Amino acid sequence: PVEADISKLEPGALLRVKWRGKPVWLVHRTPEMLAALPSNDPKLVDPNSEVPQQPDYCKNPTRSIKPQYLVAIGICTHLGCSPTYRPEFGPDDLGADWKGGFFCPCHGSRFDLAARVFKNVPAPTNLVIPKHVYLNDTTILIGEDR
Amino acid sequence: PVEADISKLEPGALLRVKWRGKPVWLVHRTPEMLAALPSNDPKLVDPNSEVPQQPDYCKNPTRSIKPQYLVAIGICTHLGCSPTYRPEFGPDDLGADWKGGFFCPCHGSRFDLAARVFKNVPAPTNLVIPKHVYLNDTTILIGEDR
Numbered sequence: 105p106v107e108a109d110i111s112k113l114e115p116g117a118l119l120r121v122k123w124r125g126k127p128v129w130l131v132h133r134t135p136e137m138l139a140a141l142p143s144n145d146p147k148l149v150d151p152n153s154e155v156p157q158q159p160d161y162c163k164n165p166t167r168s169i170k171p172q173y174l175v176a177i178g179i180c181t182h183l184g185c186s187p188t189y190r191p192e193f194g195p196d197d198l199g200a201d202w203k204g205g206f207f208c209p210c211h212g213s214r215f216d217l218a219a220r221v222f223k224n225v226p227a228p229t230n231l232v233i234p235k236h237v238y239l240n241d242t243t244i245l246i247g248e249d250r
Numbered sequence: 251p252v253e254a255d256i257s258k259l260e261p262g263a264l265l266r267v268k269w270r271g272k273p274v275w276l277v278h279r280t281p282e283m284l285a286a287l288p289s290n291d292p293k294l295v296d297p298n299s300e301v302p303q304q305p306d307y308c309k310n311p312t313r314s315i316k317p318q319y320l321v322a323i324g325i326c327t328h329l330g331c332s333p334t335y336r337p338e339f340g341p342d343d344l345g346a347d348w349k350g351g352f353f354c355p356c357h358g359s360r361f362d363l364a365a366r367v368f369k370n371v372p373a374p375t376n377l378v379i380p381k382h383v384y385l386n387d388t389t390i391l392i393g394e395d396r
């Protein structure tokens with residue numbers, strides 16, 4: 105397992121740590137980012153995380169233990185590129201209704217800020233969330249849980 | 251880093267985990283084993299761990315964070331063989347005054363239960379102790395400390 109120190113992870117920032125040769129992202133979500141997540145539901149493939157792409161303690165609307173932080177494996181579920189992080193709302197290239205999320209540059213799959221995949225892109229499932237647990241408020245252990 | 255679950259490590263037992271290609275041993279020491287350590291001092295090369303073969307939080311008489319468990323890399327400091335674990339006191343082959351420890355089969359180097367090397371053997375230093383930290387009472391994370 106690897107320890108992720110989020111003590112300096114500012115609002116909207118993304119921290120990358122390596123685990124089992126894979127990139128693990130930790131995103132500090134703002135209330136604004138969180139407020140828009142439910143609105144994505146109708147446009148998502150698996151808004152309720154029914155596909156087991158995460159431990160049960162992350163099978164929820166924000167796919168996380170705490171709303172303030174998203175923890176997920178930064179690998180596209182289509183073929184494995186690493187998606188770009190696009191937290192800004194409504195950029196011209198992604199559409200005015202874009203509420204922040206991730207965009208895979210290899211074949212266009214899109215995921216929201218709970219790493220849930222949108223309908224009709226090559227990726228068929230929400231990004232994988234690894235087992236993890238908070239050791240304390242500013243330290244998340246990735247790879248193992250209680 | 252590598253997690254070592256010592257929840258089932260009984261008194262006197264030794265757990266082996268692999269870290270960076272190296273064998274890491276975790277030994278559950280009994281009070282009897284601990285009681286005998288100071289007596290080895292006069293016969294040891296570096297009883298106070300002056301040679302930096304370990305992190306500072308292990309630079310002490312039991313070369314460990316807690317007395318109950320010894321954590322060390324199981325590689326002989328002489329030429330690299332893997333020492334045998336000999337916890338029993340006074341076996342005929344090692345001597346009646348033997349208080350438990352390690353015996354390297356390749357050229358006879360001896361180390362005590364704090365992994366400290368005895369005088370006049372081929373190995374010149376105490377076995378290396380890797381950086382590590384307790385995640386909780388029965389879980390040790392090897393390869394990192396904070």
Ligand code: FES
Binds near residue numbers: 181184209213226
């Ligand atoms: S690898 Fe991500 S859209 Fe194909």
Ligand code: FES
Binds near residue numbers: 359
């Ligand atoms: S390698 Fe251990 S005594 Fe030589």
Ligand SMILES: [Cl-]
Binds near residue numbers: 266273324332
């Ligand atoms: Cl081994």
